[PDB]
Amino acid sequence: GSSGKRPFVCRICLSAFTTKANCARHLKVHTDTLS
Ligand SMILES: [Zn+2]
Predict the structure, then answer these.
(1) When you count CB atoms within 10 A of the terminal residue's CB, does the N or C end of the chain come out lower?
(2) What is the dihedral of CA 15, 4, 24, 26, to 10 degrees?
(3) Which residue ranges are recorded for the region named Interaction with TACC3?
């Protein structure tokens, strides 16, 4: 596979995302602005 699976929980918080790509864009919140 590659992605598209549930154990993609955020490294900083604990938000789980379907794809790594979602987690990547999410990451910015933990310094830029929380959203
Ligand atoms: Zn997070």
Answers:
(1) N
(2) -40
(3) 18-29
29: number of Cβ within 10 Å: 14
Structural contact between residues 18 and 9, judged by C-beta atoms closer than 8 angstroms = no
Give the chain's domain count.
1
Taking a 5 Å cut-off on Cβ, the residues next to ion ligand 1 are 10, 12-13, 15
Which residue stretches of 1-35 are H helix?
A: 20-27
Separation of alpha carbons 1 and 7, rounded Å: 14
* Structure obtained using: NMR
φ, ψ (nearest 5 deg) of residue 9: -75, 145
